[PDB]
Amino acid sequence: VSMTKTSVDCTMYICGDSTECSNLLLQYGSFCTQLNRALTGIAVEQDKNTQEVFAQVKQIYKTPPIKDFGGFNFSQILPDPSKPSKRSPIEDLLFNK
Amino acid sequence: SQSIIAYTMSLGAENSVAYSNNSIAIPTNFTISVTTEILP
Amino acid sequence: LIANQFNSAIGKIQDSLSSTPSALGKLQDVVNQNAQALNTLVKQLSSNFGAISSVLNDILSRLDPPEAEVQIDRLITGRLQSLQTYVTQQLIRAAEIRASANLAATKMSECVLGQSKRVDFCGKGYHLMSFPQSAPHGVVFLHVTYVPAQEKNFTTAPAICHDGKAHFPREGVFVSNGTHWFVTQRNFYEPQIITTDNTFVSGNCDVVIGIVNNTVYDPLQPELDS
Amino acid sequence: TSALLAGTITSGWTFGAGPALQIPFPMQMAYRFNGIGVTQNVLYENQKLIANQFNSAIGKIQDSLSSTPSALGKLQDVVNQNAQALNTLVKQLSSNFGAISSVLNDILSRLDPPEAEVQIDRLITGRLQSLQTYVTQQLIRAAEIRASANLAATKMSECVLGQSKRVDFCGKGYHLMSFPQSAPHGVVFLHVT
Ligand SMILES: *[C@@H]1O[C@H](CO)[C@@H](O[C@@H]2O[C@H](CO)[C@@H](O)[C@H](O)[C@H]2NC(C)=O)[C@H](O)[C@H]1NC(C)=O
Ligand SMILES: *[C@@H]1O[C@H](CO)[C@@H](O)[C@H](O)[C@H]1NC(C)=O
Ligand SMILES: *[C@@H]1O[C@H](CO)[C@@H](O)[C@H](O)[C@H]1NC(C)=O
Ligand SMILES: *[C@@H]1O[C@H](CO)[C@@H](O)[C@H](O)[C@H]1NC(C)=O
């Protein structure tokens, strides 16, 4: 649904603490600005991807305290209140793997 | 009086649906809503 | 009522488009992205790229051609890199635009030329229609959708035990207003007296978990008497 | 994910088309049976059996995910590809790119600036080529990930928020539901068919 939201500062990557390298980089033009803009667009795209996949719902819903679903069991997919992060048993090993 | 406030976002109101093994909620009225979708 | 709601919804779309300036964000972003890519490509001519002159007509005049050739090589390398970067960005943007155009063609086909049962594909709600509108380098869809508004709690049961046999609704839901039991369609509260025309018998009352005792009206019995 | 699951369990598909309307799950699954041409008679005649099959299927998913390590192959591949691209980009700093030194602080010390400028030019050309390659690869990967995320949003909309009649779109068989599960940089759907 999304990829790692990395970003690269072009001046730091090309050039270390030195300023002569930066001075020679300024004469190439706006390559570094274009690269940074592309990476920022990718990051915003990843945020939009997550918000478009998972935020289909508009109002947070809660499962009733008693799971009387006529025999159908969802304890594997419903959140587990015991563990600190309210991730379901399936989600626990999905994150572990 | 007015200042920038930083907070953890709220996903929305916590709406616990009044679930039961006997209760259904059939709407008695509707709304013909027009949604605008923009596509390049 | 539905005609008035449709007209008022279209008028509200008119007003919202008139007032809010960030409505056409996708088209504006595409146009601005292309414009800034072009502007960057043009501005790349003013960069030296390591040559002692960023203008090609001065490096050929102030320097002799045998020595000016290496500076021309630096300039052409830089400008060719700029063109390759611009063309790669243009190809990626064109792939994205082609995906969006394929989605727009699919939405036109399935919503302007038909009614799509895909959920949230054409508008939030039970989709009804769609009216395309042209736009600069894009299209705008006025997805007409059906959204239920006023819900009401009811007591429901999967079946109806009458005459020692389960009765299931042919189409609809068994509901009760406290005392009397009615069968109602699934998207609009229209109570109907329970009858064999809209219920189908499907066995006996023991198997069903949730069956409730009731009576099912028989249409033909009154004509039997009279 | 929990809000989507609770809406699916309690309301059904009604929570994606307006106000969430409560309905017993033995009746929502009967809705979904009617949505595949199977009369709702079938479930109310076999409610316990279908409930047991559903529970056992979810338990088997639990066991198969726990045991087999190559289950989350797509997410693992995406993460590994991104990490490997980052590692390659970082390792590109150790390449000379034709300059007599791969470290920029030594070429400025051992060589005088007027002569060290050409070596700095070689280094910047190489590192800029590396950055452009990395950014192009990242843009292609992001286009692929955006296509996958659009597909995930479509699957959520048409199978978590409704019952899709598209064949083999959500699971092999007559689709019934789908339960989203969060995952690192992705989502997992338990397509009940
Ligand atoms: C369903 O909702 C519509 C509006 O969404 C209701 O129509 C309005 O009802 C009010 C009540 O008196 C009138 O003042 C308005 O003139 C009506 N029209 C509009 C466009 O607002 C309608 O009455 C509702 N139906 C039920 C059964 O409650
Ligand atoms: C569901 O399964 C859990 C174990 O995962 C069990 O503890 C519970 O009793 C079962 N029943 C329900 C419907 O909660
Ligand atoms: C149905 O009942 C519950 C609690 O009994 C209540 O919270 C809910 O608002 C009711 N629904 C409607 C539409 O009034
Ligand atoms: C339920 O509806 C029936 C319609 O036939 C009506 O006669 C009855 O009084 C109603 N009861 C309640 C409690 O609303």
Ligand SMILES: *[C@@H]1O[C@H](CO)[C@@H](O)[C@H](O)[C@H]1NC(C)=O
């Ligand atoms: C609903 O659940 C309650 C809880 O015990 C039970 O007494 C009742 O018989 C159930 N009714 C149906 C129709 O499932």
Ligand SMILES: *[C@@H]1O[C@H](CO)[C@@H](O)[C@H](O)[C@H]1NC(C)=O
């Ligand atoms: C329904 O009625 C029959 C006889 O009319 C009776 O044997 C049965 O116990 C009743 N069931 C319920 C749930 O009231």
